[PDB]
Each structure stands twice: as structure tokens, then as C-alpha cells.
Amino acid sequence: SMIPDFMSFTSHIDELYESAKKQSGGKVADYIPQLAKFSPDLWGVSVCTVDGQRHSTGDTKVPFCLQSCVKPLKYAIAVNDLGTEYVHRYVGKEPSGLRFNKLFLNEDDKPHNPMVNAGAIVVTSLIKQGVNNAEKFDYVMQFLNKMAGNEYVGFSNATFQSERESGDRNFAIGYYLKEKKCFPEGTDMVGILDFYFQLCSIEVTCESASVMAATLANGGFCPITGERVLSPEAVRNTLSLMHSCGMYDFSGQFAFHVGLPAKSGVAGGILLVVPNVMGMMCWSPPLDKMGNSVKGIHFCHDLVSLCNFHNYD
């Protein structure tokens, strides 16, 4: 209970929101039309406490693609169904670059961690093995529905189509992983890439995503349904890797000044988690050099300076 009075806190969220609104820097991702379309002025913040209390300000009901934000979510699912040991048999846990700047794999021929494309691609191949992509996709959709307490969870076919058609780097990664036997026996690599592109194209709203974050903040229990969605083990692992590998190269600076588990996405979203307190989703298309939403980064630094949510405060 670091939030004795929700109303007053809500009032502070609005002030912070308003302050970050003045930050107009950054560039909206434009490698595909579906991302370039977005207005640089879209800005929204949704909060969902461990209690189930809600608060939204700004453009919180405009759908956008999770993109990389889906990474910790599918990682959580894999750990939930397969266990920590099995999953990390295929992907690493190291947050460092190590001496592996832009390398698809580490010295042991394993993706560095679940938060980079190579890792997410490997994780994607571990979920619900043995069924067609249609079934795998439905499986994860149901899962995301539970995390969001049945709130908005859609799909962008146009993003999926464009992401796949222009994802040369991901295909390069897919073939290299095949070279090094990084997938489980009998994996259809190209088929896995399709599933990966689809997952990146799943849509949410600031409001529904915040519930997803709140579930991770509530030990794996959806705050608005009470249902156990993810195992404690899955949640703890996800938060650890989000804390260390979730904000691209800004992770170091982010962990030092913000000290919270988070995962950004090229659509401008930032899934934020305040363990045992609340889940949050900040969204604003304009990204900085590192690929993180400018307004989002600003907002997070401000949230911690004001409410002292840093893990080591």
C-alpha cells in the first residue's frame, strides 16, 4: 500500500501525463506504412492496480500493435507451460551485450535473452508444439485475453502482412538459428517466423495492456477477474528479464534511473510494471534513437522521481 489514496495518485498521473505531453521529440517508426500512419501526437496512459482500480488519460482506446511488447508475454507463456529449465535450454538469460553487439547468438550458440528478436523467435518455436499455426495463435490469443481480463485484444492483418514481407533481418536470423540447430527437433522455421510476425501484430489498447501489466504485477493473477493466469515462476522470470533487457540499449540507463521492469515496442508502447502495486501501458508513436517512445521514457522517469517506485527506493 504505497498508494494510500488512489484519487490523489490519479491526480498525479494526470500531471505527469500533461508534463510528458510537451515532449514532442522523436520519430514515428516508418519502415512499414502501418506504423508510419500514426499521428505523432497520440499519447495515452492507463493504470490498473493490483486492486483492480483503473485510471486512463489521453488516447487510451486507440488500438496499436504490441510489437516487441509481446515478447515478455510469450516468454511468460512458455515458462508457464514448459518451466524455467526447459525454456532456457534454448535461450539465454544474459542482459549484457557481452561483446556480442548485433550478433544473433552468443558463444554457446543461443540467443542472448528472450527480449531480442533471435530470442523471441526461439521462444515462439517452443509454444504449443505439434499443432498448426492457427491453433498456436488461438492458444496465445486466449492467453492474452486472460491476462487482459477479457479486455481489448485484436489483430492487425495489414501489419502482419507488411512485417513479414519486409522482415529480411528476421529471416536472416531464422536461417542462422536453423544453421546452429537452435530450434526444437522438427521445427518448421519459416512457419515459426509467420507465427512470430502474427504475434507482433496483435493489437491492444492502453487500457487492456495495462491490465496485462497488472497481471504481471499481481504475481500472475488478473487484477480484474481474480483468475490465476501465469505461474509465479513465469512471472518472476519475466520481470527479471524485463528489468534487464526490456528497453533495448537504454536498459542500463533505464534500470539505474527508473528501476522498474518494462518492455518497449516500435509502435510507441511501453509495458510498465510496479511489482505488487500496479501495471501500466504508456503509448506514443514517436520513438527516440534507441527505439523507445519519447513521451513514454519521459513519463517513466517522472513517475519514479515523484512517487518513489524505484525498486531500490
Ligand X SMILES: O=C(Cc1ccccc1)Nc1nnc(CCSCCc2nnc(NC(=O)Cc3ccccc3)s2)s1
100 binds a second copy (CB under 8 A): yes
**Of 56, 205, 237, 292, which one interacts with a second copy (CB under 8 A)?**
237
- The stretch among 17-25, 60-68, 99-107, 204-212 that binds a second copy (CB under 8 A) is 99-107
The length of the chain is: 313
* Minimum CB–partner distance for residue 240 and a second copy (Å): 5
Query: Which of a second copy, ligand X, none does 33 bind, CB closer than 5 to 8 A by kind?
Result: none
Question: How near is the Cβ of 84 to a second copy at its closest, in Å?
Answer: 9
Binding of a second copy by 73 (CB under 8 A):
no
How many residues interact with a second copy (rule CB under 8 A)? 44
Quick one: cell of 290?
534507441
Question: What, of ligand X, a second copy, none, does residue 97 touch, CB below 5 to 8 Å by kind?
Answer: a second copy
75-94 footprint of a second copy as x/- string (CB under 8 A): -----------------xxx
Q: Which of residues 153-192 bind ligand X (CB under 6 A)?
A: 176
Distance of closest approach, residue 189 Cβ to ligand X, in angstroms: 16
Provide the binding-site residues for ligand X, judged by CB under 6 A.
99-100, 102-107, 176
Q: Which residues bind a second copy (CB under 8 A)?
A: 92-104, 168-169, 171-176, 178-179, 232, 235-237, 239-241, 243-244, 251-253, 255-256, 259, 261, 275, 310-313
